[PDB]
Design a protein around this nucleic acid. Structure first.
Ligand SMILES: [Cl-]
Ligand SMILES: [Mg+2]
Ligand SMILES: [Mg+2]
Ligand SMILES: [Mg+2]
Ligand SMILES: [Mg+2]
Ligand SMILES: [Mg+2]
Ligand SMILES: [Mg+2]
Length: 327
DNA sequence: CCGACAGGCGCATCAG
DNA sequence: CTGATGCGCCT
DNA sequence: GTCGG
């Protein structure tokens, strides 16, 4: 299916173990870094020493790669796969709203199956309850055809609330992916800038309208600038319903759109790589601004930005189109 | 050898 | 009630 | 787990 798929699968599985079971986030990310650089490597890897030349692959992963190439498996992962506790904790984290901490606690309390979760909903917070309700649906991917229908609904309903809003579908969709895990919507309005909020309830307005027309069905979390919830396309007579889908909406100051869209377009690993490179170059990037770093570590004042490319220029990177920011 | 590893929103919890 | 903390999440 | 001072 992919060039070094066995190796990248192995490393991703180790990343998940370190995140979900070990609760070691830097090992998680180190494994993800290695998987990422390897996935982009345009040769079929013949040895661990060859892999070790790539940035992010060290002695330990090279050693694992040699085992995998020689035997087709990793004894370390075979052990983890048979460990009941590890498997159960891993499984529970697949429910949206259950992370490593909550999964371990549930598993300690004897709760380790979908059945167990369902007969213990009173032990779940709101988010987790909705994640359980739509467990199967949330692991389905969204065909780009459906993303396009969803975009049409969101853009048209936003326009009905106020023609001044601009809604931009970001994430994997903006990177040209033929399928997406969920929908990410960046929202701006003239009355919300970094200098003032001249109208309240800007995000609420939009969420309310999408609820009215039955597009948004559930709310996981909702503040002044970020909505996390569930939506569903309308189905026609006699047709099975579409799966429920995860949707995220982020209201960003209009004058900080470019940092906002850079953030929201990702990928996640791309953002981590780009932000880490910015730090190396003496800058810090968030979804709002790019700022210089002084000697002390105090971030300076936001630099002027009027394109995505400007952010790349500051850190001396050649521009990468959204399509080339994917894993 | 070892300090740093991206950055931040919303929620739930804790001390006072 | 604040204010601080950490979880789980987003890209 | 990795790597640049
Ligand atoms: Cl606001
Ligand atoms: Mg989860
Ligand atoms: Mg994602
Ligand atoms: Mg997405
Ligand atoms: Mg999302
Ligand atoms: Mg229905
Ligand atoms: Mg964090």
């Amino acid at each position: 299916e992919t060039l070094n798929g066995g190796i990248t699968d192995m490393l991703t599985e180790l990343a998940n173990f370190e995140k979900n079971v070990s609760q070691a986030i830097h090992k998680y990310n180190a494994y993800r870094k290695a998987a990422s650089v390897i996935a982009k490597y345009p040769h079929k890897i013949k040895s661990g020493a060859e892999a070790k030349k790539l940035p992010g692959v060290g002695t330990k992963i090279a050693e694992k790669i040699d085992e995998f190439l020689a035997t087709g498996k990793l004894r370390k992962l075979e052990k983890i796969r048979q460990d009941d506790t590890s498997s159960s904790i891993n499984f529970l984290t697949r429910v949206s709203g259950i992370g490593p901490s909550a999964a371990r606690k549930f598993v300690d309390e004897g709760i380790k199956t979908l059945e167990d979760l369902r007969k213990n909903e009173d032990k779940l917070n709101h988010h987790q309850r909705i994640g359980l309700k739509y467990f199967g649906d949330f692991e389905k991917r969204i065909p780009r055809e459906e993303m396009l229908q969803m975009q049409d609904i969101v853009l048209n309903e936003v326009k009905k609330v106020d023609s001044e809003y601009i809604a931009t579908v970001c994430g994997s969709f903006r990177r040209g992916a033929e399928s997406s895990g969920d929908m990410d919507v960046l929202l701006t309005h003239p009355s919300f800038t970094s200098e003032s909020t001249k109208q309240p309830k800007l995000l609420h307005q939009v969420v309310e309208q999408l609820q009215k027309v039955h597009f948004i069905t559930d709310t996981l979390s909702k503040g002044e600038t970020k909505f996390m919830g569930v939506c569903q396309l309308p189905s026609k007579n006699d047709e099975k319903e579409y799966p429920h889908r995860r949707i995220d909406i982020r209201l960003i100051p209009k004058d900080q759109y470019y940092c906002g869209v850079l953030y929201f377009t990702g990928s996640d690993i791309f953002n981590k790589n780009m932000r880490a490179h910015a730090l190396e170059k003496g800058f810090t990037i968030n979804e709002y601004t790019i700022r210089p770093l002084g000697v002390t570590g105090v971030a300076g004042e936001p630099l002027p930005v009027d394109s995505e490319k400007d952010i790349f220029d500051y850190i001396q990177w050649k521009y990468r189109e959204p399509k080339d920011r994917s894993e």
